[PDB]
Amino acid sequence: AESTLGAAAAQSGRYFGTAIASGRLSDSTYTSIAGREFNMVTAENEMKIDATEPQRGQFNFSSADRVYNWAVQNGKQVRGHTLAWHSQQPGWMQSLSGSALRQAMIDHINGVMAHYKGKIVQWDVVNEAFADGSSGARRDSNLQRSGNDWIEVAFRTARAADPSAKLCYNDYNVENWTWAKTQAMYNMVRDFKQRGVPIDCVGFQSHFNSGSPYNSNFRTTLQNFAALGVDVAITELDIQGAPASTYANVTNDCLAVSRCLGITVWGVRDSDSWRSEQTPLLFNNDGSKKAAYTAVLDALNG
C-alpha cells in the first residue's frame, strides 16, 4: 500500500491529478500538499484562449509557463486545457465569423502546440460542443456557425502539430449512459473512427451534483466508449458535499475499465474550488484530510 494519492494510483499504471492556479503558488500549504499528493497537473485558466493569445498573432505564455514549470520541477506530467471553446474567447476572436474565424482557430492551435511540442501528454482539443437538454444538438457559438466540420478540423490540425500528444474531446453532463447528450457524443466518436478523424481520448468532466447526479451506469458509459477505440479519463471531478461513498464508487469505476487512464480532481482544498460553497473536494480549508480522502486512498490500494 502507498500513502499518497498519486503513488497509490501509479501502482495500477494510472495517475491522480489536480487543477493548479498560478495565483495560489505563493501559499505554502497549497504548494506542499499539491506537491506531495498528485502526479498530474492541469492549469485551471492559464492555457485558455484569452490567456495565451490576447491579441491576434501575439502569444503570451508567461502564466502558462509558470504552471508548466512548477509541474515539471515537482515531478508531474501535464494535461493541456483547452484549444477550442465557445467560452473565454478574447474580444478579437468573438468578432470573427466564417472562414476568417476558421483560419484564426487553426493559427491558435498551431501556435500554442508548437510552444509545448513533445512536453504535454494529453490535450483537451475541443471543449463543451454539445447543448444541454433532450435534443442532442450542438451548442450555438461562432465556431459552430462556421460549419458542422469545425470539430474535425481542430482534431486534424492538432494531430499534425504534435503527433506525440493524446488528443481528447472533453465535456460535462455526459456521464449517464441514458442521457441524450451522452448519446450525441457517442455517435460523434463512432463517426470519427469510421472516417479516420484523429481522436485518442474522451474526457468526462464528472461535475456531480444534485442536478447531475452520479449513477452506477457510469461504468457502462466508460466501457462502451473504450470499446470504440479511445482511452477515457475523468478530467474535472468534484462532488457536492464530498460523500465518501460516491468518491469511492467513481474511483472503482475507473479501476474496472482497462483504458481508464486516471482521475483529476478540480482543485486542492474546498476553498480553492470554483464551487467552494458546495464543499466538494478532498481536503479541508486548513489542509487536513476529509473522510472522502481516506475512501479514495483505500480504493486505490485495493
Coordinates of N, CA and C in Angstrom, one line a residue, residues 26-189:
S26 N 1.9 31.2 -4.2 CA 2.7 31.8 -3.0 C 2.2 31.2 -1.7
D27 N 1.1 30.3 -1.7 CA 0.6 29.7 -0.5 C 1.3 28.4 -0.2
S28 N 2.1 28.4 0.9 CA 3.0 27.2 1.2 C 2.2 26.0 1.6
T29 N 1.0 26.1 2.1 CA 0.2 24.9 2.4 C -0.3 24.3 1.1
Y30 N -0.8 25.2 0.2 CA -1.2 24.7 -1.1 C -0.1 24.0 -1.9
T31 N 1.1 24.6 -2.0 CA 2.1 24.0 -2.8 C 2.7 22.8 -2.2
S32 N 2.8 22.7 -0.9 CA 3.4 21.5 -0.3 C 2.4 20.3 -0.4
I33 N 1.1 20.5 -0.1 CA 0.1 19.4 -0.3 C 0.0 19.0 -1.7
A34 N -0.1 19.9 -2.7 CA -0.3 19.6 -4.1 C 1.0 18.8 -4.5
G35 N 2.2 19.3 -4.1 CA 3.4 18.7 -4.5 C 3.5 17.2 -4.0
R36 N 3.1 16.9 -2.8 CA 3.1 15.6 -2.2 C 2.1 14.6 -2.8
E37 N 0.9 15.1 -3.1 CA -0.2 14.2 -3.3 C -0.5 13.8 -4.8
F38 N -0.1 14.6 -5.7 CA -0.6 14.5 -7.1 C 0.6 14.2 -8.1
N39 N 0.3 13.4 -9.1 CA 1.4 13.2 -10.2 C 1.0 13.7 -11.6
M40 N -0.1 14.5 -11.7 CA -0.6 15.1 -12.9 C -1.2 16.4 -12.6
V41 N -1.0 17.4 -13.5 CA -1.5 18.8 -13.3 C -2.2 19.3 -14.6
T42 N -3.3 20.0 -14.4 CA -4.0 20.8 -15.4 C -3.9 22.3 -14.9
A43 N -3.6 23.2 -15.8 CA -3.7 24.6 -15.5 C -5.1 25.0 -15.5
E44 N -5.6 25.7 -14.4 CA -7.0 26.0 -14.3 C -7.5 27.0 -15.3
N45 N -6.7 28.0 -15.6 CA -7.0 29.1 -16.5 C -6.0 29.5 -17.5
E46 N -4.7 29.2 -17.2 CA -3.6 29.9 -17.9 C -3.3 29.4 -19.4
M47 N -3.9 28.3 -19.8 CA -3.7 27.8 -21.1 C -5.0 28.0 -22.0
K48 N -6.0 28.7 -21.5 CA -7.2 29.0 -22.3 C -6.9 30.0 -23.4
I49 N -7.8 30.3 -24.3 CA -7.5 31.1 -25.5 C -7.2 32.6 -25.1
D50 N -8.0 33.2 -24.2 CA -7.8 34.5 -23.8 C -6.4 34.8 -23.1
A51 N -6.0 33.8 -22.3 CA -4.7 33.9 -21.6 C -3.5 33.8 -22.5
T52 N -3.6 32.9 -23.6 CA -2.5 32.6 -24.4 C -2.4 33.5 -25.7
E53 N -3.5 34.0 -26.2 CA -3.4 34.9 -27.4 C -4.3 36.1 -27.2
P54 N -3.9 37.1 -26.4 CA -4.7 38.2 -26.0 C -5.0 39.2 -27.2
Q55 N -4.1 39.2 -28.2 CA -4.3 40.0 -29.4 C -4.0 39.0 -30.5
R56 N -4.7 39.1 -31.7 CA -4.4 38.2 -32.8 C -3.0 38.1 -33.2
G57 N -2.4 36.9 -33.2 CA -1.0 36.7 -33.5 C 0.0 37.1 -32.5
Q58 N -0.4 37.5 -31.3 CA 0.5 37.9 -30.2 C 0.3 37.0 -29.1
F59 N 1.2 36.0 -29.0 CA 1.1 34.9 -27.9 C 1.8 35.4 -26.6
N60 N 1.2 35.0 -25.5 CA 1.7 35.2 -24.2 C 1.7 34.0 -23.4
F61 N 2.8 33.4 -23.1 CA 3.0 32.1 -22.3 C 3.5 32.3 -20.9
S62 N 3.5 33.6 -20.4 CA 4.1 33.8 -19.1 C 3.4 33.0 -18.0
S63 N 2.1 33.2 -17.8 CA 1.4 32.5 -16.8 C 1.3 31.0 -17.0
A64 N 1.1 30.6 -18.3 CA 1.1 29.1 -18.6 C 2.4 28.4 -18.3
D65 N 3.5 29.1 -18.6 CA 4.8 28.5 -18.3 C 5.1 28.5 -16.8
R66 N 4.5 29.4 -16.0 CA 4.7 29.3 -14.5 C 4.1 28.0 -14.0
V67 N 2.9 27.6 -14.5 CA 2.3 26.4 -14.1 C 3.0 25.2 -14.6
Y68 N 3.4 25.2 -15.9 CA 4.1 24.1 -16.5 C 5.4 23.8 -15.8
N69 N 6.2 24.9 -15.6 CA 7.5 24.7 -14.9 C 7.3 24.2 -13.5
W70 N 6.3 24.7 -12.7 CA 6.1 24.2 -11.4 C 5.8 22.7 -11.4
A71 N 5.0 22.2 -12.4 CA 4.7 20.8 -12.5 C 5.9 19.9 -12.8
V72 N 6.7 20.3 -13.8 CA 7.9 19.5 -14.1 C 8.9 19.5 -13.0
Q73 N 9.1 20.6 -12.3 CA 10.0 20.7 -11.2 C 9.6 19.8 -10.0
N74 N 8.3 19.6 -9.9 CA 7.7 18.7 -8.8 C 7.4 17.3 -9.3
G75 N 7.9 16.9 -10.4 CA 7.7 15.5 -10.9 C 6.4 15.1 -11.5
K76 N 5.6 16.0 -12.0 CA 4.3 15.8 -12.5 C 4.3 15.9 -14.1
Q77 N 3.4 15.1 -14.7 CA 3.1 15.3 -16.1 C 2.0 16.4 -16.2
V78 N 1.7 16.9 -17.4 CA 0.7 18.0 -17.6 C -0.3 17.6 -18.7
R79 N -1.6 17.9 -18.4 CA -2.7 17.9 -19.4 C -2.9 19.3 -19.9
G80 N -3.0 19.6 -21.2 CA -3.3 20.9 -21.7 C -4.8 21.2 -21.8
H81 N -5.2 22.4 -21.4 CA -6.6 22.7 -21.4 C -6.7 24.2 -21.7
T82 N -7.3 24.6 -22.8 CA -8.0 23.9 -23.8 C -7.9 24.8 -25.1
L83 N -7.9 24.1 -26.3 CA -7.5 24.8 -27.6 C -8.7 25.5 -28.3
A84 N -9.9 25.0 -28.2 CA -11.0 25.5 -29.0 C -12.3 25.3 -28.1
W85 N -12.9 26.4 -27.8 CA -14.0 26.5 -26.9 C -14.9 27.8 -27.1
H86 N -16.2 27.7 -26.9 CA -17.1 28.9 -27.0 C -16.9 29.9 -25.9
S87 N -16.3 29.5 -24.8 CA -16.2 30.4 -23.6 C -14.8 31.0 -23.4
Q88 N -14.7 32.1 -22.8 CA -13.4 32.8 -22.5 C -12.6 33.0 -23.8
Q89 N -13.3 33.4 -24.9 CA -12.6 33.9 -26.1 C -12.2 35.4 -25.9
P90 N -11.0 35.8 -26.3 CA -10.7 37.2 -26.3 C -11.6 37.9 -27.2
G91 N -11.8 39.2 -27.0 CA -12.7 40.1 -27.8 C -12.4 40.0 -29.3
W92 N -11.2 40.0 -29.7 CA -10.9 40.0 -31.1 C -11.4 38.7 -31.8
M93 N -11.5 37.6 -31.1 CA -12.0 36.3 -31.7 C -13.5 36.3 -31.7
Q94 N -14.1 36.9 -30.7 CA -15.6 37.0 -30.7 C -16.1 37.7 -31.9
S95 N -15.4 38.7 -32.4 CA -15.8 39.4 -33.6 C -15.7 38.7 -34.9
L96 N -15.0 37.6 -35.0 CA -14.8 36.9 -36.3 C -15.9 35.8 -36.5
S97 N -16.1 35.5 -37.8 CA -17.0 34.5 -38.3 C -16.5 33.8 -39.5
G98 N -17.1 32.7 -39.9 CA -16.8 32.1 -41.2 C -15.4 31.7 -41.4
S99 N -14.9 31.9 -42.6 CA -13.5 31.5 -43.0 C -12.4 32.2 -42.2
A100 N -12.7 33.5 -41.9 CA -11.7 34.3 -41.1 C -11.6 33.7 -39.7
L101 N -12.7 33.3 -39.1 CA -12.6 32.6 -37.8 C -11.9 31.2 -37.9
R102 N -12.2 30.5 -38.9 CA -11.6 29.2 -39.1 C -10.0 29.3 -39.2
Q103 N -9.5 30.2 -40.0 CA -8.1 30.4 -40.0 C -7.5 30.9 -38.7
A104 N -8.2 31.7 -37.9 CA -7.7 32.1 -36.6 C -7.7 31.0 -35.7
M105 N -8.7 30.1 -35.7 CA -8.7 28.9 -34.9 C -7.5 28.0 -35.2
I106 N -7.2 27.7 -36.4 CA -6.1 26.9 -36.9 C -4.8 27.5 -36.4
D107 N -4.6 28.8 -36.7 CA -3.4 29.5 -36.2 C -3.2 29.4 -34.7
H108 N -4.3 29.6 -33.9 CA -4.2 29.5 -32.5 C -3.7 28.1 -32.0
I109 N -4.3 27.0 -32.6 CA -3.9 25.7 -32.3 C -2.4 25.5 -32.6
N110 N -2.0 25.9 -33.8 CA -0.6 25.7 -34.2 C 0.4 26.4 -33.3
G111 N 0.0 27.7 -32.9 CA 0.9 28.5 -32.1 C 1.1 27.9 -30.7
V112 N 0.0 27.5 -30.1 CA 0.1 27.0 -28.7 C 0.8 25.7 -28.7
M113 N 0.4 24.8 -29.6 CA 1.0 23.4 -29.6 C 2.5 23.4 -29.9
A114 N 3.0 24.4 -30.8 CA 4.4 24.5 -31.1 C 5.2 24.8 -29.9
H115 N 4.7 25.7 -29.0 CA 5.4 26.1 -27.8 C 5.6 24.9 -26.8
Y116 N 4.7 23.9 -26.8 CA 4.7 22.8 -25.9 C 5.0 21.5 -26.6
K117 N 5.5 21.5 -27.8 CA 5.7 20.2 -28.6 C 6.5 19.2 -27.9
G118 N 6.0 18.0 -27.7 CA 6.6 16.9 -27.0 C 6.6 17.0 -25.5
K119 N 6.0 18.0 -24.9 CA 6.0 18.3 -23.5 C 4.7 18.0 -22.7
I120 N 3.6 17.9 -23.4 CA 2.2 17.8 -22.8 C 1.7 16.5 -23.3
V121 N 1.3 15.6 -22.3 CA 0.9 14.2 -22.7 C -0.5 14.1 -23.2
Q122 N -1.5 14.9 -22.8 CA -2.8 14.9 -23.3 C -3.3 16.4 -23.6
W123 N -4.0 16.6 -24.6 CA -4.7 17.9 -24.8 C -6.2 17.8 -24.9
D124 N -6.9 18.7 -24.2 CA -8.4 18.9 -24.4 C -8.4 19.8 -25.7
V125 N -8.5 19.2 -26.9 CA -8.5 20.0 -28.1 C -9.8 20.8 -28.3
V126 N -10.9 20.1 -28.1 CA -12.3 20.8 -28.2 C -13.0 20.5 -26.9
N127 N -13.6 21.6 -26.3 CA -14.3 21.5 -25.1 C -15.8 21.9 -25.2
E128 N -16.7 21.1 -24.7 CA -18.1 21.6 -24.5 C -18.9 22.0 -25.7
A129 N -18.8 21.1 -26.8 CA -19.5 21.4 -28.0 C -21.0 21.0 -28.1
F130 N -21.5 20.2 -27.2 CA -22.9 19.8 -27.2 C -23.8 20.7 -26.3
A131 N -25.0 20.8 -26.7 CA -26.0 21.5 -25.9 C -26.5 20.6 -24.7
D132 N -27.0 21.2 -23.6 CA -27.6 20.5 -22.6 C -29.1 20.3 -23.0
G133 N -29.7 19.3 -22.3 CA -31.2 19.0 -22.6 C -31.4 17.8 -23.4
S134 N -32.6 17.6 -23.9 CA -33.0 16.4 -24.6 C -32.7 16.4 -26.1
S135 N -32.2 17.4 -26.8 CA -32.1 17.4 -28.2 C -30.9 16.7 -28.8
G136 N -29.8 16.6 -28.0 CA -28.5 16.1 -28.6 C -27.9 17.1 -29.6
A137 N -28.4 18.3 -29.7 CA -27.8 19.2 -30.7 C -26.5 19.8 -30.3
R138 N -25.8 20.4 -31.2 CA -24.6 21.2 -31.0 C -25.0 22.5 -30.3
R139 N -24.2 23.0 -29.4 CA -24.3 24.3 -28.8 C -24.1 25.4 -29.8
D140 N -24.9 26.5 -29.7 CA -24.7 27.6 -30.6 C -23.4 28.4 -30.2
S141 N -22.6 28.8 -31.2 CA -21.4 29.6 -31.0 C -20.9 30.0 -32.3
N142 N -20.0 31.0 -32.4 CA -19.4 31.4 -33.6 C -18.7 30.2 -34.3
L143 N -18.0 29.4 -33.5 CA -17.4 28.2 -34.0 C -18.4 27.2 -34.7
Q144 N -19.5 26.9 -34.1 CA -20.5 26.0 -34.7 C -21.1 26.6 -35.9
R145 N -21.4 28.0 -35.9 CA -22.0 28.6 -37.1 C -21.0 28.6 -38.3
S146 N -19.7 28.4 -38.1 CA -18.8 28.3 -39.2 C -19.0 27.0 -40.0
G147 N -19.6 26.0 -39.4 CA -19.9 24.7 -40.0 C -19.8 23.5 -39.1
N148 N -20.5 22.4 -39.4 CA -20.5 21.2 -38.6 C -19.2 20.6 -38.5
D149 N -18.3 20.8 -39.5 CA -17.0 20.2 -39.5 C -15.9 20.9 -38.7
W150 N -16.3 21.9 -37.9 CA -15.3 22.6 -37.1 C -14.5 21.7 -36.1
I151 N -15.2 20.8 -35.5 CA -14.6 19.9 -34.5 C -13.5 19.0 -35.2
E152 N -13.9 18.3 -36.3 CA -13.0 17.5 -37.1 C -11.7 18.3 -37.5
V153 N -11.9 19.5 -38.0 CA -10.8 20.4 -38.4 C -9.8 20.6 -37.3
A154 N -10.4 20.9 -36.1 CA -9.5 21.2 -34.9 C -8.7 19.9 -34.6
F155 N -9.3 18.7 -34.6 CA -8.5 17.5 -34.4 C -7.4 17.2 -35.4
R156 N -7.8 17.3 -36.7 CA -6.8 17.1 -37.8 C -5.6 18.1 -37.6
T157 N -5.9 19.3 -37.3 CA -4.8 20.3 -37.1 C -3.9 19.9 -35.9
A158 N -4.5 19.5 -34.8 CA -3.7 19.2 -33.6 C -2.8 17.9 -33.8
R159 N -3.3 16.9 -34.5 CA -2.5 15.7 -34.8 C -1.2 16.1 -35.5
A160 N -1.3 16.9 -36.5 CA -0.2 17.3 -37.3 C 0.8 18.2 -36.5
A161 N 0.3 19.0 -35.6 CA 1.1 19.9 -34.9 C 2.0 19.2 -33.9
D162 N 1.5 18.1 -33.2 CA 2.3 17.4 -32.3 C 1.8 15.9 -32.3
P163 N 2.4 15.1 -33.1 CA 2.0 13.7 -33.2 C 2.2 12.8 -31.9
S164 N 2.9 13.3 -30.9 CA 3.2 12.6 -29.7 C 2.1 12.8 -28.7
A165 N 1.2 13.8 -28.8 CA 0.2 14.0 -27.8 C -1.1 13.2 -28.0
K166 N -1.7 12.8 -26.9 CA -3.0 12.2 -27.0 C -4.1 13.3 -27.1
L167 N -5.0 13.2 -28.1 CA -5.9 14.2 -28.3 C -7.3 13.9 -27.8
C168 N -7.8 14.7 -26.9 CA -9.1 14.4 -26.2 C -10.2 15.4 -26.6
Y169 N -11.5 14.9 -26.6 CA -12.7 15.7 -26.6 C -13.2 15.7 -25.2
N170 N -13.6 16.8 -24.6 CA -13.9 17.0 -23.2 C -15.3 17.6 -23.0
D171 N -16.1 17.1 -22.1 CA -17.5 17.7 -21.9 C -18.0 17.2 -20.5
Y172 N -19.1 17.9 -20.1 CA -19.8 17.6 -18.9 C -21.3 17.2 -19.2
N173 N -21.9 16.6 -18.2 CA -23.3 16.0 -18.3 C -23.3 14.9 -19.4
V174 N -22.2 14.2 -19.5 CA -22.1 13.1 -20.4 C -21.7 11.8 -19.7
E175 N -22.0 11.7 -18.4 CA -21.6 10.5 -17.6 C -22.7 9.4 -17.5
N176 N -23.9 9.8 -17.6 CA -25.1 8.9 -17.5 C -25.4 8.3 -18.9
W177 N -25.3 7.0 -19.0 CA -25.4 6.3 -20.3 C -26.7 6.6 -21.0
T178 N -27.8 6.9 -20.3 CA -29.1 7.1 -20.9 C -29.4 8.5 -21.4
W179 N -28.6 9.5 -21.1 CA -28.9 10.9 -21.5 C -28.6 11.1 -22.9
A180 N -29.5 12.0 -23.5 CA -29.3 12.4 -24.9 C -28.0 13.0 -25.2
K181 N -27.4 13.8 -24.3 CA -26.1 14.4 -24.5 C -25.0 13.4 -24.7
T182 N -25.0 12.4 -23.8 CA -24.1 11.3 -23.8 C -24.2 10.5 -25.2
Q183 N -25.4 10.2 -25.6 CA -25.6 9.5 -26.9 C -25.1 10.4 -28.1
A184 N -25.3 11.7 -28.1 CA -24.8 12.6 -29.2 C -23.2 12.5 -29.2
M185 N -22.6 12.5 -28.1 CA -21.1 12.3 -28.0 C -20.7 11.0 -28.5
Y186 N -21.4 9.9 -28.2 CA -21.1 8.5 -28.6 C -21.2 8.4 -30.1
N187 N -22.2 9.0 -30.8 CA -22.4 8.9 -32.2 C -21.3 9.7 -32.9
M188 N -20.8 10.8 -32.3 CA -19.8 11.6 -32.9 C -18.5 10.8 -33.0
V189 N -18.1 10.2 -31.8 CA -16.8 9.4 -31.8 C -16.9 8.3 -32.7

